Amino acid sequence: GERSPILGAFKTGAAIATIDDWYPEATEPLRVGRFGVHREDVTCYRHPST
Amino acid sequence: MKLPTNLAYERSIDPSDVCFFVVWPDDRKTPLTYNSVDFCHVPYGASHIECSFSVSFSSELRQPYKCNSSKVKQTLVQLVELYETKIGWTELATRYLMNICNGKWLWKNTRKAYCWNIVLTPWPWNGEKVGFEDIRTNYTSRQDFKNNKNWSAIVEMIKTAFSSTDGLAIFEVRATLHLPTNAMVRPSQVFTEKNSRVFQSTTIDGERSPILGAFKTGAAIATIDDWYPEATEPLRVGRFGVHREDVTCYRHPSTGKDFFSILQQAEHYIEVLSANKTPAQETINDMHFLMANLIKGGMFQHK
Amino acid sequence: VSGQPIKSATAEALAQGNPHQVDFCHVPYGASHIECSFSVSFSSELRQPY
Amino acid sequence: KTITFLPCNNESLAAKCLRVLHGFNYQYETRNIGVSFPLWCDATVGKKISFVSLLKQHYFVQMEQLQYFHIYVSFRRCQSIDKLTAAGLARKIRRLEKFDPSSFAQKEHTAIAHYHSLGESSKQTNRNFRLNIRM
RNA sequence: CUGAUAACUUACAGGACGCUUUGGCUUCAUUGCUUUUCAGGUGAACUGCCGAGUAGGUAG
């Protein structure tokens, strides 16, 4: 009968898919997506100019 | 140097709520309760009072949590790595840890106490819990803390925590307050947009109990600032560092020694630290105030 | 916006007090530890396009 | 008669009038004369004080010379309200020992209905108390 | 000081009878809301007596 905090379903699938460390200057793995973004430093590695 | 449109850090010190207990003779513990203005007092046959919480030191200072400019990101990583090499973490880690090791986080409950004791339980540690017996008698100044059998081993934890990409340093703090008979206890109290004082509480077992808040406790560990002009007493570390007895801002932007004016001179501080001539005390004071606000964290944006 | 100090923000008005409201979740006092449970499937949707 | 205050605080001024009524009753050992306030409003005790059954005492005469004076229901003292303070809760347990003191517990929720204490003191000792007075 | 001056539009009344709208149907793929946070006015309305009393009364 209580409210309880969750750690969501779309949040959890983002953690399983932090695999992308093949972008051209890779140090840290990224969440897999088109033009794979990094939201630490708000940029796109794998931009279409790459 | 310009401020970016995204700049934010996480805090490097994480305290918790402080829970209160009543120790009866023959040594059994009971959570403290109060009435309803609210009033909280020690019960009659009680011996003393326990207080317990926990503090972590977890190195979020090294990199920004969020920064959309790669020029400003490399400006941080040079500052923390040059402060560590030239000045070191010995001064800040001593000033944070002395607020844990005395009763600074016990705000007005230290007031009118017979004696109080602090027992630390550091986690990446072998054994023999660190004890501080009879503060107001034994632990008065900085030299009294350094004469403890293991003070270097605990300062070097917080130094190692800040000087590593994964530094952890968990402390389990426990206090023992010997009050007079039917004495005051002053917990923290809620914020109402309005004598009419409500306490902050949790639930231990099935009974309400006063707490001393997690944000209230972190404001007592970070009373370090005394690097401002005059510096009569320490101030809670913050931007344009305020006092709350008198509603004033020391380190106003007209003074030129707030945190946002020292950020524009952060490129200047790198060549001062990368030289070989030891920096002047005033400049380092602004480097201690620069580092203590990155340990505090916060949004540092503009526009 | 430009960078000069605004003159309405005097040293009295800048030490005033800013109340925020947040959700706060913590571990209870006498607790031992915390369980966290969920489930994942791996179910071959990449063989042909949808 | 009714004494109406016209200069202020009606709390700490009506309590002075009862102390003169107090010291009058031990010179002459009389307990007949009583006290009541017609303007017994919620906000304050009021500016009107009347005695039914004092004006020749040194207090009321010197206060008359200045610009400020003029010279059914029941008003009784409730000392159960003096026991509701936490200093008085500890006085209550010391008698009951003179026994588990940890078996007791606080009420944690109490409601008090219009206690109107007038602050006074003792002269036999140097000790303070209140006049918790209701209707 | 008026396209000036003056001015009674009246009476009476029945809209009704009848009525089948129906048949068929896939909305569907992907998803991180995050960073930082002192509510303070607690010098005080105390100390005794009675009662078997966490009841209830009264003294200064």
Side-chain angles (χ1 to χ4, degrees), chain D residues 89-119:
Chain D
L89 296 171
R91 287 186 285 112
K92 187 175 179 180
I93 302 299
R94 288 190 289 121
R95 296 171 189 170
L96 298 176
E97 184 179 1
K98 292 181 180 179
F99 183 75
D100 194 4
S102 65
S103 66
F104 292 96
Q106 306 180 5
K107 292 181 181 179
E108 295 183 355
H109 290 285
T110 183
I112 301 168
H114 227 290
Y115 65 101
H116 220 105
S117 70
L118 306 160

Side-chain angles (χ1 to χ4, degrees), chain D residues 26 79 83 87 91-92 94-95 103-104 115 124 127-130:
Chain D
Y26 293 93
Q79 296 189 3
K83 293 181 181 179
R91 287 186 285 112
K92 187 175 179 180
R94 288 190 289 121
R95 296 171 189 170
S103 66
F104 292 96
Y115 65 101
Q124 293 177 335
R127 189 173 290 160
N128 292 318
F129 59 94
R130 298 288 176 180

